[PDB]
Symmetry: D2
Subunit: 272 residues, 4 copies
C-alpha cells in the first residue's frame, strides 16, 4: 500500500487548477504577487487586507481579469476574533479552502537598548502571534491534504544586521512553528512550511532597505538597488515579489507533497 | 533594469519543455525517476549509468515512449576522465545542456573503529569527489541560466543514526558545496542547490533500511515499510522516488530562479 | 605582492590571562532570573562556588530563594535575593536597579526563568500563547535590555533556549518550542548591538534536565509514556536521548554557563550552545 | 497519575566535581596534530598551562615542534614531539602507539592539522581536491578512528572545522569549505559511536585567526584585498568580521578547546562550536 503514487506523474503535479487559496495581506507587496500568481495557476483566491481596501479590490479585479475567481476579506491579524471571522467568511465564499499563505507582517529597527514594550508587542502581535492564530484557523478549515505556508525572513538566521533583534526574533520563531505545526497538522495530511525571503522590492523594502546598509542613509533609490543586487546576490539582481510567489506555488502544489516542516530560503544566495 | 520580471508569469514558469537534462545514475532508483519525470515535463535526457546497462537502456526507451528523446552514456564518477568524456558526448548528442542532476551515490555502514581507508575512499570518491567533478564539468557545459542539483541526504544533519560517519560525512560536504558553488557558478547565472531526501523506496533502501532501525535486523519487508511510515513521517507513509523527482523539476525550472545555495529537505518531516 | 612577513601589531594583544586563570569567576557579580529552584538554582550555586557574588531572582519561590542565598553564603560567596516577575517590564527595571546597588556592579546575567506548555495547535488559546511568550520570549528580551544597560564593559549575557527550538519530533509543542526558537535569533542579533559595550551574548539550549519542570512534563515527550514510573521515565531519558546513557542534570548546564561567563568564552558570541548529551528530538 | 514526588535515583549522581575543579586538566594527557605552529601550537601551550602532558605532533616543522615541547616543559608540564603525516593512515596508527608508550595514556585528542586552498570550481583539478580532502577530511577521520581506539573511557575528541563549513559569501572556496563542512557531520555521527566509551566528540569552527595560514590567504576572503598592507588586513578583519572589533587569536580557540576537554564539557557532545567573535561570512 506504501507503493501507491501520490498524485499525478508528469507536469500536472504542478497544477493548482481548481484549488482555493487564502492569502493574508494580499492587497500589496509580496502577498499581492502570491495572490496574482496563485490565480494565474488556476486558484480561486481570497485576498485578505487590514487597511488597503482599494488596493485589495484592485487585486481581486486583476485576478478575475486573468481568468480566476477572487474575493476580498477584511481582517486584522492582531485580533484573533478577526482571524476566526475571516476564515468562517472565507469558506462560505468558495465552499472550501485548500491553501493558506500567512504573509501579513510589519518591520522594525532599533538598538536593543531603545526597544519599548509597546514596539516589541506591536511586532510580535502581528508577525508571530498573528501567524500562529492564522495557522490555527487554517488547520481547522483546510481540506485534507491541504497546505499552510508561513512567512519568515532571512533575518531569522542573519548574523550581521544591527538594531534588528525584535523583527528578526519575530521571524525566527516562525521556523520553529513550521517544524512543530508540521507534526500536528499532518493528522489532516496538511504540509506546513516557511518561506524565508531575502530583500524583495516592495513598500517595506522602500521604507527600510537603507537600514540594512552600513552608511546607506543618503543612497539614492538607484544606488540602493545596485547595492542590494551586488552585495546580496552572486546573481547580481534585486529580489522581486514574483521570486517568492513562484516558490509558494510550488509548495502549494502536489510537487511539494513530501516537503513539510521546512524553511525554504529565497534570497538569491544572500549572506546577511 | 532591476524591475524586469525574470521569465514568464503564470504556470509557464514551471515548464521544462525544450530543455536538455543530464542525470547521473539514472538507470535505477531516484536517478531513474528524475530522468522519467524530467522527460514527462518535456526534457530530452542523458541517462548516465556505471553498471546497469540494461536498466539504463530501458529508461531511455520509456522516455522516448513518453514523448521525449533520450540517450544513455556510461561513466564511472570515480574516474574524472569518464566524467569529462560523458559531458562532451552529452553536448554532441543534444547540442546543449540546461540541467544537470548529480545523483549517483553509494551507502555504507560501520562503527568508526572498523572503518578502513579503502571503504572511506570508496564512499568519498563517489559521493563527494564524484559529485564535485560532475559539478565542475556541468559548469563548463551548462547554458547561461542553467541548473545544477546535487544529491545530499537527511544524514548530512541527522543526529541519531549510529555507525554512519562515513556516508553521512560524504553527504554533509555536499551542503557546503552547494553554498560555495552557488557563488562561483552564478557568473553563468547557474543556480546550485542540494536535495536532501529522507528514506526513499529504492534498491539502496532495500539493502540498508534496517540499519537505521534499532533491533530491525529481523523485520519483514512489510514491517520495515510500516516502521518507516510511522517513525519517519507525521504524514504516515514511505518516501518514493517521485517525491524527490518533483522537487528536482521545481528547482530545474524558472520557478527555482531565486533559490540558490540552499539545502532542500524532502523527508516528509522526518526526525533522524 | 605584499612581502612583509607576519608581525606583532596592536591586534596581537592577548585578551585576559594565559592559563587556568582564564576560567576564573573570582570577584564577579552575577544575576540569575528564577534562581530559587531548577536550572537557575544550580547556575547560582555553581557561579557561587567559582567566586561570584550572586543575585538570586525569584517570582514566587520565596523560601527556596532564601535557601539558595544561604547556601551560597555558606559555600564562601555573598548572595542576595530579589523578587521580580519577568512578565512585568517595570519589575525587571526595578530588579536591575536594586541589583547594582547590592554589590556595586553586574558582570554576568543569566536569563533563565521560563514555563513549559503542551497542546495541539488546534486547541491553543490566545491566553495560553500569551502566557508562554510573555515569560519565555518577551520576558527574556527585556531582561536582556536591562542587562545591556547595567552590565560592566566586557560583560556577559546568557539566554535560556531549549533543544525544542530546533527539535523535529515533539508533537503538540509549537507554542513553547517557538518561544525558545526566537531566543536563538535574539542571541545573534543582540550579540551585534551589545558588542558596543564588549558584552558577549549567547544562548544555552538544554535537552531534558531533571528539575521540577522535567518532573511535570517529561512524559509528554515520550510516546505512550503516561503510565511510566519515575524510574522508567529516567531510564527512557537516559537511553533514548543520549548515546552517553544518562539523564541531564542542572550541573551539566551550570558548568557550560560558567565557561561562557568566564574569559574562556571571550570569542564565543551570538552562538547557540546545545547541552543535551547528544540528544535527537 | 504518578504522584510520587521527585526523588534522588542512580541518575542523580553528579558527574565529576562541583565547583572550579571541574575545569581542571591537571594530570591529563593530550595529543594535538600539527602542534608545531599556529592554532595547534597554542592548543598545546594552553593545555600544558592547565596541567596536561602533551604530545606535539608535526609533519614538517621539526624545529618549531621542538621549541613547543621545550616551552611546555619550561611552563611546568611534560611534553614530547611525534612526527606523523595525517595523509598516511599508517603514520597515524604509529603516532598513537608511540604516544601511549610515552605517557601511558591519552585523555584528550585535538585533530587540528589542515591546509587551505582557493580556486574557482571550474579550475579545480583532481589533484588539488585530493590534496585538500586527504588532509582535512580523510586525515581527521583516521585521526578520530585511532583516537577512539586509544582514548581513556570518558575521554575527549575535538575536531577542527571552520566558519567556512557554513559560510555563504566566500568565492572560489568550495574545496576547502567542503572539506571542513564534512567535519561537522562527522562530529554528530562520531559522538554516537564513541559514546560507547563515554568519549565526547565536538568540532570547533574558528573564524579568521592570526597564524601563518591567515597571513598566507586572508586577502582571498577580502574583495579587492590583494594590495592591502598587513596592517590594513588586520583592521579589515577586526571591523568586518566582528562586532567586538578585534582580530581572532590562537588563544581564543585554545581556551574553548580546554573547556571542551574538561569535565565542564561533559554534556556537550556532537556539537559545532563557532568561535569567530560573531562573524558573518
Ligand atoms: N520586502 C522584503 O524585503 C521582505 C518581506 N518579508 C515578509 O513578507 C511579508 C510581506 O512583506 P511586504 O510585502 O514587503 O510588506 P509591505 O509592508 O509591503 O505590506 C505587507 C502586508 O502586510 C499586511 N498587514 C500588515 N498588518 C496587517 C494586519 N494587522 N492585519 C492584516 N494584514 C496586515 C499589509 O496589508 P494592509 O495594507 O492592509 O495593512 C500588507 O498587505 C511580511 O510578513 C514581511 O515581513 C520577508 C523578507 C523580506
Ligand atoms: N534511497 C534513499 O533512501 C536515499 C538515497 N539518497 C541518495 O540518492 C542517490 C540515489 O539513491 P538510490 O536511487 O536509492 O540508489 P541505488 O543504490 O538504488 O542506485 C544508486 C545509483 O548510483 C549509481 N552509481 C553508483 N556508483 C556509480 C559510479 N561509480 N558512477 C556512476 N554512477 C554510479 C548507480 O548506477 P549503476 O547501477 O550503473 O552502478 C545507481 O544508478 C544516492 O546518491 C543516494 O545516496 C539520499 C537519501 C536517501
Ligand atoms: N528542565 C528541562 O528539561 C529544560 C528546561 N529549560 C529551560 O530552563 C529554564 C529553567 O527550567 P527549570 O529549572 O527546569 O524550571 P522549573 O519549572 O523547575 O522552574 C523554573 C524557574 O522559572 C522561574 N520563573 C517562572 N516564571 C517566572 C516569572 N514570571 N518571573 C520570574 N521567574 C520565573 C521559577 O521561579 P518561581 O518559583 O519563583 O516562580 C523557577 O525558578 C526555563 O526557561 C526552561 O524552559 C530548557 C530545556 C530543558
Ligand atoms: N587560521 C585561521 O584563520 C583558521 C584555521 N582553521 C583550521 O585550523 C587548523 C590550523 O590552522 P593554522 O594553525 O592557521 O595553520 P598553519 O597553516 O599555520 O599550520 C597548520 C598546521 O597543520 C599542520 N599540518 C599540515 N599538513 C599536515 C600533515 N600532512 N600532517 C600533519 N600535520 C600537518 C602543520 O604542520 P607542519 O608544519 O609540520 O607541516 C601546521 O602545524 C587547520 O585545520 C585550519 O584549516 C580553521 C579556521 C580558521
Ligand atoms: O525581512 C527582510 C530581510 C532582508 C531585507 C533587505 C532589505 C530590505 C528589507 C529586508 N527585509 C525586509 C525589508
Ligand atoms: O540516505 C538515507 C537517509 C535515510 C534513509 C532511511 C532508510 C533507508 C535509507 C536511507 N538513506 C539511504 C537508504
Ligand atoms: O525544554 C525541554 C526540552 C526537552 C525536554 C525533555 C524532557 C523534559 C523537559 C524538556 N524540556 C523541558 C522539560
Ligand atoms: O578557515 C578560515 C575561515 C575564515 C578565515 C578568514 C581569514 C583567514 C583565514 C580564514 N580561514 C583560514 C585562513
Amino acid at each position: 500500500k506504501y507503493d501507491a503514487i501520490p498524485g499525478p506523474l508528469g507536469p500536472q503535479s504542478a497544477s493548482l487548477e481548481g484549488k482555493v487559496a487564502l492569502v493574508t495581506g494580499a492587497g500589496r507587496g509580496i502577498g499581492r504577487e502570491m495572490a496574482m500568481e496563485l490565480g494565474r495557476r488556476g486558484c480561486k483566491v481570497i485576498v485578505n487586507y487590514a487597511n488597503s481596501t482599494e488596493s485589495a479590490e484592485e487585486v481581486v479585479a486583476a485576478i478575475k481579469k486573468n481568468g480566476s475567481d477572487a474575493a476580498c476579506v477584511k481582517a486584522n491579524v492582531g485580533v484573533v476574533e478577526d482571524i476566526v471571522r475571516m476564515f468562517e467568511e472565507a469558506v462560505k465564499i468558495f465552499g472550501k479552502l485548500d491553501i493558506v499563505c500567512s504573509n501579513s507582517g510589519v518591520v522594525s529597527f532599533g538598538h536593543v537598548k531603545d526597544v519599548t514594550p509597546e514596539e516589541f508587542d506591536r511586532v510580535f502581535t502581528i508577525n508571530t502571534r498573528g501567524q500562529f492564530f492564522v495557522a490555527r484557523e487554517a488547520y481547522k478549515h483546510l481540506e485534507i491534504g491541504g497546505r499552510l505556508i508561513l512567512m519568515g525572513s532571512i533575518t531569522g538566521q542573519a548574523k550581521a544586521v544591527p538594531k534588528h533583534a525584535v523583527y528578526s526574533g519575530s521571524k525566527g520563531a516562525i521556523e520553529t512553528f513550521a517544524r512543530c505545526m508540521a507534526i500536528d497538522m499532518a493528522d489532516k495530511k496538511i504540509t506546513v512550511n516557511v518561506v524565508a525571503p531575502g530583500g524583495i522590492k516592495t513598500d517595506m523594502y522602500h521604507a527600510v532597505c537603507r537600514e540594512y546598509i552600513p552608511n546607506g542613509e543618503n543612497l539614492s533609490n538607484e544606488e540602493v538597488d545596485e547595492y542590494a543586487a551586488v552585495q546580496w546576490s552572486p546573481l547580481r539582481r534585486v529580489g522581486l515579489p514574483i521570486d517568492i510567489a513562484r516558490v509558494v506555488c510550488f509548495l502549494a502544489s502536489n510537487d511539494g507533497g513530501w516537503v513539510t516542516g521546512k524553511v525554504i530560503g529565497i534570497d538569491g544566495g544572500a549572506c546577511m
